[PDB]
Amino acid sequence: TEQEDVLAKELEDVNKWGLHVFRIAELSGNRPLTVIMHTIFQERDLLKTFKIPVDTLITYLMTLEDHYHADVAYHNNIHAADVVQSTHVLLSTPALEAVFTDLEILAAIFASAIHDVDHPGVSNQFLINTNSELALMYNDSSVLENHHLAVGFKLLQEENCDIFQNLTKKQRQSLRKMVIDIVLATDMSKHMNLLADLKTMVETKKVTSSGVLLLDNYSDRIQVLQNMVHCADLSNPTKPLQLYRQWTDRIMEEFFRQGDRERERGMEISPMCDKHNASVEKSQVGFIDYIVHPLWETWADLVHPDAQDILDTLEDNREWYQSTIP
Numbered sequence: 260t261e262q263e264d265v266l267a268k269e270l271e272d273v274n275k276w277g278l279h280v281f282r283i284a285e286l287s288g289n290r291p292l293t294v295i296m297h298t299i300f301q302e303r304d305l306l307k308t309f310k311i312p313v314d315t316l317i318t319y320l321m322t323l324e325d326h327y328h329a330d331v332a333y334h335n336n337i338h339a340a341d342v343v344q345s346t347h348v349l350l351s352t353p354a355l356e357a358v359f360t361d362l363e364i365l366a367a368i369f370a371s372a373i374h375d376v377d378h379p380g381v382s383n384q385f386l387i388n389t390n391s392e393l394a395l396m397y398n399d400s401s402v403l404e405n406h407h408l409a410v411g412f413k414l415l416q417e418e419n420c421d422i423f424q425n426l427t428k429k430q431r432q433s434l435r436k437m438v439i440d441i442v443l444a445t446d447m448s449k450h451m452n453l454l455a456d457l458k459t460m461v462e463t464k465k466v467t468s469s470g471v472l473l474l475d476n477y478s479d480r481i482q483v484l485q486n487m488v489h490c491a492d493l494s495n496p497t498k499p500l501q502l503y504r505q506w507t508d509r510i511m512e513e514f515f516r517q518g519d520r521e522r523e524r525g526m527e528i529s530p531m532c533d534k535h536n537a538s539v540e541k542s543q544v545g546f547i548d549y550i551v552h553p554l555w556e557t558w559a560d561l562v563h564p565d566a567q568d569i570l571d572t573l574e575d576n577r578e579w580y581q582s583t584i585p
């Protein structure tokens with residue numbers, strides 16, 4: 260049908276920053292994670308490399324996607340698809356050419372796909388403050404992130420869902436460890452420490468004559484993968500403005516809903532969650548200045564000059580949001 264043809268055409272931009280992910284979500288019947296993951300797995304020849312049966316991949320992807328909440332405005336299957344595709348583009352950076360193995364590539368992409376699964380639309384701090392069952396289970400540390408991992412891995416056990424069935428025991432152990440290390444690193448409470456270590460690597464950077472990064476041990480390799488997926492997670496402000504604005508509307512909706520729950524419970528309303536006392540534009544400029552730009556400028560230095568266009572877009576968007584403040 261016409262819908263299928265237009266979807267296929269939009270998916271031709273899968274290797275580009277600024278993919279029309281919302282349009283893909285609409286055209287696919289709200290299956291952006293399934294179609295984008297499938298497209299990327301075919302593009303990178305991952306099904307053949309890891310002997311993943313196509314039916315198994317689609318079954319797992321659809322099940323995983325079903326565990327993202329359709330009533331959560333930001334932390335849903337569209338965000339997951341976006342982080343997956345963003346990681347996919349970052350992995351193709353010329354400075355990282357042939358740096359990571361196929362298993363490491365698989366781990367980064369899989370981690371991106373499951374990284375927010377079953378997100379309830381409220382923060383770790385909210386879960387801790389409300390004495391939730393999740394915070395009790397996880398002892399207040401990386402509560403959501405531990406849960407996303409547990410669900411992502413548990414779903415592999417469903418009927419015809421083990422996409423890693425033909426990996427060796429060693430490969431399965433290695434992939435699991437890498438995925439856990441990556442998703443736990445998406446917890447924002449770990450941002451400052453991750454950035455500090457990324458800055459240290461940039462200062463002690465070792466490269467070939469062409470500018471390709473030389474990473475030998477696991478500690479350095481996983482650190483780059485952790486920061487890569489963290490950058491992908493925090494990539495909305497670096498995308499074309501039309502996309503960024505849509506992501507902002509979505510996170511503000513989610514935040515305001517959390518603030519409504521806090522207000523009625525007599526709790527202090529979390530930053531950016533009070534719909535009656537919000538400054539959306541000022542908050543975006545602040546988030547770029549204090550979190551997103553420091554991170555992306557450091558990533559840009561690591562892969563210089565491959566991320567210049569991304570950094571340029573970030574700065575363009577910061578300038579535009581600032582202009583909306585009288």
Ligand SMILES: CCOC(=O)c1c(C)n[nH]c1C
Nearest residue numbers: 495496503506507510543546
């Ligand atoms: C698109 C704008 O996103 C944010 O402001 C934001 C913050 C702050 N925390 N998480 C997100 C996604």
Ligand SMILES: [Mg+2]
Nearest residue numbers: 374375445446
């Ligand atoms: Mg998360």
Ligand SMILES: [Zn+2]
Nearest residue numbers: 338374375492
């Ligand atoms: Zn996320």
